[PDB]
Design a protein around this ligand. Structure first.
Ligand code: RET
Ligand code: RET
Ligand code: RET
Lengths: 221, 221, 221
């Protein structure tokens, strides 16, 4: 199509689809309720991302937001994605360490705040205010990372939890930077490069994360 | 009103309302926590449908979607309905057989994918792509039906579960067909007939299903 | 800004923010899982309200709804707020008295119906129908209050539950009145006064309620 980021949307669509079918095949057989739980959550994540990548690819998850006296193309469908997939990823983590419900509610709630404010930021027509929403969203992220480190077993659990937690902090932290420097933000880095950055992070945080998780014996009772 | 499907919207509004008041009266008295659970879920379903039928009746849940070079009237409020009511119906089933949380999450998640993609399909302005969303949605449905049959007691539970599961597969399967042949799809069958088909399915899947369920002793500890 | 209700939006933004930081500091230290649960829920409430107050302040949560042959300014972001915060407040109550899941599902479901119909009412372009949605929403509220009184311990639990339940019925009941007499409704009381009324209720129902709750020992095992 007439959009140069189409290739990354198509590649992300493809990789999320393949990841979904892999984990779907993979989870065939599992009878342990606990593992079943990790398979459900972890397959749903790239399944959802698959549809939102397709929606961006086909142009449905794309809108135009006027700001800085111009018509800026915003892929809103990333937030419909993250809205659902980021809490699920946090659940994987939470279930791994047997977190209190209070801590899970704090994380999921913090998360919704993170994406929803990111969304508002993305759709806001007053340029300056866009970065107020960014700041609040980033504060929510920082709370989440705080909890992951100070708000929380079988060594297998701990070992896998430590790895995925590290994967999580490192990739999740890059998203505010990408946003801030890309088309939604200061407009430093073009949309096509921004889309590639998000595709590389999304596949790693979704399919990379799930591969690490689902190969672990930490998921079995 | 100037819409010939108004009669079916009015009749559905009426039947969902009556079903809600019946199950509300019916559940008065119930102290068994387990049955209480089935009453809550099963009353909420036509209550929600009642509001969405009223919203379509009054014209609020109706929008115009350009495709095939025409202004197509789409009742989007059906998806706000299903978004909430189809997972609840799946919960009735899941609680009946004491399903693992992993299986419940897979079903609810599969379900959201089903309706959300149906919604995107419904609102998509490129005619051809409408049926890509249909296909994905249908794949989600097929997964759900798979799980209902291969992903899962007191004989009462089994007996009622077997009946409602059969009701479920048969009516849920007709919805993709109706969509595909009606105004959202190929435009084979007019909107007023399509609305009647959906009203007959919705009342049967909601009020018919609940009557069968709530008369059963399968719902009591 | 050019809006005379800005001061109340700014004051609400401020008070919700301060309430969020107070309860966040306050909950530092808590290790009792049960109390943790009450801290999560109760901090999230004004956190969410903070963002929606900011969104109204900045003008993002404001839209124009034509009715009565005029362009009526509707703050839709109040419903995005309530959609999440009113169920959470009901959870605080529900967890306090150890409510059955059936009763919690009935309350949360009743609640979503309440706000969602309030939203539809708010955005409806046919003046008369606006009050049909109001009536249904009010019926949902009345059900909720019914349950709080007839649908349900340590004396501490009972004592705090009795107080907060009284706070709840009294403030929640004023919201339908405010709506009905203000800009969304009959247009009796101007928007700026309406916004002040909602700001006073919101801070009391959110921060006032949380202060009463979180000072109680009812929240600890
Ligand atoms: C499945 C994809 C994942 C793990 C995406 C994570 C996205 C975030 C952690 C986003 C955070 C952002 C902020 C902290 C600042 C504002 C903009 C956002 C939403 C990109
Ligand atoms: C309360 C009403 C019920 C049980 C409705 C069920 C609706 C479905 C099972 C819808 C499925 C569809 C597809 C599988 C294809 C795409 C379009 C849909 C959403 C009509
Ligand atoms: C955090 C704020 C709270 C507790 C807000 C509560 C709001 C309600 C109880 C709203 C109810 C309304 C109706 C019953 C009638 C229609 C309009 C509403 C949504 C204002």
């Amino acid at each position: 199509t007439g959009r140069p980021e189409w290739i990354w949307l198509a590649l992300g669509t493809a990789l999320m689809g393949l990841g979904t079918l892999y984990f779907l095949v993979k989870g065939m057989g599992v009878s342990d309720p606990d593992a079943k739980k990790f398979y459900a959550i972890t397959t749903l994540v790239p399944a959802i991302a698959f549809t939102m990548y397709l929606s961006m690819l086909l142009g449905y998850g794309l809108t135009m937001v006027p700001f800085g006296g111009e018509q800026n193309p915003i892929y809103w469908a990333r937030y419909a994605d993250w809205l659902f997939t980021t809490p699920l990823l946090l659940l994987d983590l939470a279930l791994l360490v047997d977190a209190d419900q209070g801590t899970i509610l704090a994380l999921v709630g913090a998360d919704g705040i993170m994406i929803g404010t990111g969304l508002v930021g993305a759709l806001t027509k007053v340029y300056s205010y866009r970065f107020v929403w960014w700041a609040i969203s980033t504060a929510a992220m920082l709370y989440i990372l705080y909890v992951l480190f100070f708000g929380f077993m079988r060594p297998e659990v701990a070992s896998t939890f430590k790895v995925l937690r590290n994967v999580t902090v490192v990739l999740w932290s890059a998203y505010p930077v990408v946003w801030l420097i890309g088309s939604e933000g200061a407009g430093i880095v073009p949309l096509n490069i921004e889309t590639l950055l998000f595709m590389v992070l999304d596949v790693s945080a979704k399919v990379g994360f799930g591969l690490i998780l689902l190969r672990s014996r930490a998921i079995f009772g």
